[PDB]
């Protein structure tokens, strides 16, 4: 699958994932891109904040889903 990952942007970049990809691994893509620690990131999908240990097969993510990755803490 491709999942789109939107961080501090109007658009999400395409990420090749599979059924075994965890939310944590997904955060680490952004962590490494943006130089933010993964424990300061959160994944929001279709009004659910998804925890680190969930995998793609164990949540509602599917082909071409878009997730919004946000920073916590961050100055509002």
Swiss-Prot record:
Expressed in all subdivisions of the brain (at protein level). Highly expressed in brainstem, cranial nerve, pontine, cerebellar nuclei, indusium griseum, nuclei reticularis, strata oriens and laccunosum moleculare of the hippocampal CA2 region. Low levels were found in the telencephalon and diencephalon. Expressed in heart, liver, skeletal muscle, kidney and testis. Disruption phenotype: In brain, increased protein levels of p53/TP53 and CHPF. Cortical neurons display a slight increase in process fragmentation but no dendritic retraction. It comes from the Eukaryota. Residues 1-76 form the Ubiquitin-like domain. Auto-ubiquitinates in an E2-dependent manner leading to its own degradation. Also polyubiquitinated by RNF41 for proteasomal degradation. Transmembrane segments: none annotated. The modification Phosphoserine is found at residue 65. It is found in: Cytoplasm, Cytosol; Nucleus; Endoplasmic reticulum; Mitochondrion. Belongs to the RBR family. Parkin subfamily. The ubiquitin-like domain binds the PSMD4 subunit of 26S proteasomes. The RING-type 1 zinc finger domain is required to repress p53/TP53 transcription. Functions within a multiprotein E3 ubiquitin ligase complex, catalyzing the covalent attachment of ubiquitin moieties onto substrate proteins. Substrates include SYT11 and VDAC1. Other substrates are BCL2, CCNE1, GPR37, RHOT1/MIRO1, MFN1, MFN2, STUB1, SNCAIP, SEPTIN5, TOMM20, USP30, ZNF746, MIRO1 and AIMP2. Mediates monoubiquitination as well as 'Lys-6', 'Lys-11', 'Lys-48'-linked and 'Lys-63'-linked polyubiquitination of substrates depending on the context. Forms an E3 ubiquitin ligase complex with UBE2L3 or UBE2L6. Mediates 'Lys-63'-linked polyubiquitination by associating with UBE2V1. Part of a SCF-like complex, consisting of PRKN, CUL1 and FBXW7. Interacts with SNCAIP. Binds to the C2A and C2B domains of SYT11. Interacts and regulates the turnover of SEPTIN5. Part of a complex, including STUB1, HSP70 and GPR37. The amount of STUB1 in the complex increases during ER stress. STUB1 promotes the dissociation of HSP70 from PRKN and GPR37, thus facilitating PRKN-mediated GPR37 ubiquitination. This is E3 ubiquitin-protein ligase parkin. The chain holds residues 1 to 76 of 464 of the full protein.
